[PDB]
Symmetry: C3
């Protein structure tokens, strides 16, 4: 007897104060401001939210969102009021209509939603009024809808709840089917599911607990108050910037399983940095409905380690040519010293330290780019990129030449003659380097005129025959500059240094 | 009596038309083309798909995939046909064999899977034939496997379904154990689980509903047709580029829980942009098996806000030195004006607008790079990077010098003399700037020869003693260029401007 | 009778060897080393791990982690020993205390956790000793806590398990409530839940199976051994770099649902590349508790396709101005040829190949940057960026000018005169190009002095009046260089080429 009454409660129960709140997904909105309301369109899985527009007579935005919380479009109700609650009613032709109270014209409206559209005041005046006959000159309410029973509920400032038939209001029929009274801490959201009414309250402080009160529309009295703690960025009651404001609730009934969820919108983050997170209370198995919706819009390919560390290259990779899989990698100096096919300037390995390797998300045919960033703190950071493509018939790779992204720091890119076999001609990678007087003496192809003094070395891009022009500018108080062409591959110098001075 | 028959159905039922389809994960494939089939290797959690090769006599690719849908390797069956279905049979030594019909040689084959391998026609001719004796000169079928019962099923073009024992076919035994007939809308997939046969149909149009027909192998007749709608990128029946083609099904039996799932492959996206998404119908609790597999391969560290906005820096961060946590951030102009340790050119804050801050996914020892991008629309975008490392013994950070990534726009990088205390020597960050005639008059260290005319200022990289060379090129119709070295830190000028003309 | 005993087992059972291990999330740690232990703080959802410090007398780190595995802070116990197990005890004021055995001072300690703090030896000597009276000169144990029953358990090297009351130890009361003996393969973790004791074993090899032994504290004997296989990066027993070491276990009791989970920490990856992954065994419905915690810290906005391919632009996008949604995109050469508002140098489309398009994660007001990377393998890669902002009142976009990131390769950026209507003045984008002798003859505004010979073309940044200076350096063995200003927009040349030689 009892074991079944326990299993049925756990499997089929939907008593709010017995359910655990769980994070569902984040969601957006056009405004850099807190959220206000949240609603689900059960026929599409679209989400709709409202936000203030922050204007002299307050208006609000309506945001149309993907099932994963991304912004599709927004609609502004100029001087429409706070937009505390709205009601969704999808029409037969697939167009969405929004039940809202336009405070500017003092009318209950059923507006057609339009993508990235501004509903100015002059248009709102010409729209059809659906305000009930008994509610003229009494415009202190906002509407919401009970989808399961097709009810249009009106919430009044003084705390009056009016349950009406949506079809009745659409047909200009004034009939109040149910009326109850709701009553430091003020209203943050309201949702109605049949006989059950839910009342969200709590302020943004970390010290203010979030609470949902459950009421019965037949009895008219409170069943219970349900305080609860949510897990934020850093855990329970540790939200980013110590801000956690409740911003609306809605009941969702799964069209297929007919089982229920109560969704809760929270805004976290500090001033000018607000972002919105959806939480929920679920019957057994219903969290998966929204997890799948989140997963569809999530990043499902791993770009970094789960703790924010860059990926490490597999142990079996001993050749940069084989690191063709997209991701953000890092290799330490030891690995950079041994990997095959690293960028060279003759005998010198250009990347002579640890290195970030950004392998681009690939083309549709698995082509990609390797972007290397030499990781040092005492020298400039070198950035180089090369591309590569895969032949889908031979399954062999073709690797392109290296492009250098120009970088410079207030410290020298020092050239040690011995590392280049004492050949300036080895340096054919574009960029600016410095040769000290001591090293100039050791370079075999240094210009005699400045054999014992330092100079900046500048290397140009290639010409049509694969040659690059090297320029030496003497680091002295008089103008002395030389140039000479070098073949980038063979390092053969075309002619001796030519003086410009 | 009834409450238990309801709980048991919900907990232990696996009736297809009572189950909700849920997105599972995306998955890849070597070809830039639609998917064709999908199968699970229960002993490894590997997935296998097939794709056309798009060649004159059609061949197909076999893709070996990770449990999270990433591509491990592929195998091409040159002129093997469409590859509509295949059968997986993992051998004892851990090698995978693929049951497939090679249309080019007109033989049912059991081929060893090889990574990134091309099975050309000459090799396929020397492979062992497993075509049943009664099926020679009748090669209009493809094979599939029922893992739970070790059956090898053959699907014929005319709609004949032949259920055979896999071991029998391997032993060259011709015995048809069961045969039934399946019968605008054509076949997109077939899966067999014991007595239950599933038949997938539907075309790529948004107006064509996806449907799975359930049949009984003992009765031979249809039990029911099950049409359903899937939730795509933007919700129910809103797939990217209005393309949603069904591309195969398979039944999965959990080796541990022995509970079942029916997985469904869809291809979305437009021409040349196809991508594949896995959906599923699950017994209670079985979705978690595949969610964990997706999660293992997903990006589990937050790089951006959930709606695509960049991260905001925490309110407690008032110093760039403290923003060492990986992620893609943005700070507005106000924050950029106040943050400590922002890049300077003397008294001038280089980033004089909003700024993107890319904090690299870190090294294994939590070293990282901060890449700043000044966000403007009327001026060029400045990009600068610096590195930093953490001492694991003292838990103190060491910050490196700033590297400038060279950027230029068809508009000037304007120098206002007052912002640099009227010292050109303050500008020691490498790059090109412009000084108007009016501002040259206000700079104290301007060259007298061009005191009243504008000029481009070019600042080089450092030399060995921390000095940088400034170059001024007069913006006039005659050649006038000067240079002078400046110490990057102290802004001390080594000597007066030296004319090159 | 039996159908209920089956449902109750499946719904309410927590028998370890009947549960499936599932990946939960990855987690970090300050050290580049394997993990050692894992524990949950049920009052915050924080996680705590330990790692060796790899020093001459071994110490260990304590890592405080977010519910999604990110590193909050770490605390080093200098010469504290191996840190094999620890016990969490959260105090009333919200501060965390750690039960640990400090091998350096040979004392059982209850240390206050401090963020990024080094507990040196001199401080550890002045801390209060909680070692039981009967355990002096017998310091071969580490502590752990059974949260549900407030027990402090001591594990000894010889295999002795001592169950004590935590409050007793805090009050310096020496009372052993339960003692049992546990007994190639050694201990990797231990967790106690009431009467149940769990013993983790197995080494890092792929050929060494992970195993948890379940014991009863009342009987003192083993109930059963439970070997199991985990799914790693590439599937079951396919971990990265063939390394899979078990690194601790803990029992978690959900404070709300009172249902249980057994969590297991694994370290994967090769030497110097270790990373940690959390697995778990769950009662029905309890996996969702940790999935929501992972999801809160995951990347929930899609930057790439699920297989690592870059995003494709929607078919309805025929204008770069409309690609304002964040993400990493790629367009092929055909699409780059047709898209409106691509970068131009007069009549020439600069991006004359496939192109990666990085649309930055947006500002709080949906401003973003488009970073283009021309994808070629035989030519240099061009990188250009522009910004754009959205007017929240008009919902119209403002697009900024293009910035060029300087790039160069050892091959030429070839200029074909016909593509620029035979006007060098068309090339106003900053950078270095090459004009062959043949093409110089075809350019109408080439300098006569070098009409028949090649030259590098260098284009500067703009000045105050929107003009850019073009420089031509003759590719000959004698010094010949010219300059001339051109208006970037109208391509009007201000004056003829001015010789520097």
């Amino acid at each position: 007897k009892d074991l079944i009454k326990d299993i049925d409660r756990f499997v089929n129960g939907f008593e709010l104060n017995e359910l655990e709140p769980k994070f569902v997904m984040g969601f957006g909105g056009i405004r850099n401001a807190v959220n206000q309301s949240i609603n689900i369109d059960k026929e599409t899985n679209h989400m709709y939210s409202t936000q203030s527009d922050s204007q002299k007579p307050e208006g609000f935005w309506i945001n149309k969102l993907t099932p994963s919380g991304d912004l599709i479009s927004s609609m502004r109700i100029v001087q429409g009021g706070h937009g505390t609650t709205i009601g969704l009613e999808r029409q037969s032709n697939g167009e969405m209509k929004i039940w809202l109270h336009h405070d500017g014209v003092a009318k209950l409206l059923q507006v057609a939603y339009k993508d990235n559209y501004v509903l100015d005041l002059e248009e709102a005046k010409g729209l059809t009024d659906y305000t009930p006959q008994s509610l003229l000159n009494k415009h202190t309410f906002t509407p919401l809808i009970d989808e399961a029973n097709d009810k249009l509920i009106l919430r009044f400032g003084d705390g009056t709840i009016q349950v009406r038939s949506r079809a009745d209001v659409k047909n200009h029929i004034d009939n109040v089917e149910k009326e109850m009274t709701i009553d430091n801490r003020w209203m943050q959201g309201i949702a109605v599911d049949g006989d059950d009414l839910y009342w969200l309250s709590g302020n943004s402080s970390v010290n203010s607990h979030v609470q949902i009160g459950k009421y019965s529309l037949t009895t008219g009295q409170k069943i219970y108050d349900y305080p609860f703690k949510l897990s934020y960025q850093d855990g329970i009651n540790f939200p980013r910037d110590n801000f956690k404001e409740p911003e609306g609730i809605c009941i969702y009934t799964n069209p297929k399983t007919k089982r229920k969820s109560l969704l809760l919108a929270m805004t976290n983050g500090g001033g000018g940095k607000r972002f919105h997170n959806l939480y929920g209370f679920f019957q057994l198995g219903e969290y998966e409905h929204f997890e799948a919706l989140r997963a569809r819009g999530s990043q499902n390919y791993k770009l970094t380690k789960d703790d924010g560390r860059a990926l490490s290259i597999p142990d079996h990779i001993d050749d940069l040519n084989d690191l063709t899989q997209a991701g953000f990698y890092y290799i330490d100096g030891g690995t950079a010293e041994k990997l095959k096919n690293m960028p060279m300037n003759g005998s010198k390995r250009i990347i002579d330290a640890g290195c970030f390797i950004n392998v681009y998300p690939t083309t549709q045919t698995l082509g990609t780019v390797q972007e290397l960033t030499r990781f040092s703190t005492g020298r400039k950071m070198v950035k180089m990129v090369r591309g590569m493509t895969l032949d889908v018939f031979t399954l062999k790779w073709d690797y392109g030449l290296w492009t250098t992204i120009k970088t410079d720091a207030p410290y020298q890119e020092y050239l040690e003659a011995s590392q280049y076999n004492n050949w300036i001609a080895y340096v054919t990678t574009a960029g600016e380097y410095y040769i000290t007087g001591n090293q100039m003496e050791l370079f075999r192809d240094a210009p005699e005129e400045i054999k014992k003094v330092g100079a900046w070395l500048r290397v140009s891009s290639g010409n049509a025959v694969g040659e690059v022009r090297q320029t030496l500018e003497a680091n002295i108080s008089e103008y002395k500059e030389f140039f000479s062409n070098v073949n980038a591959e063979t390092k053969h110098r075309e002619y001796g240094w030519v003086a410009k001075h």
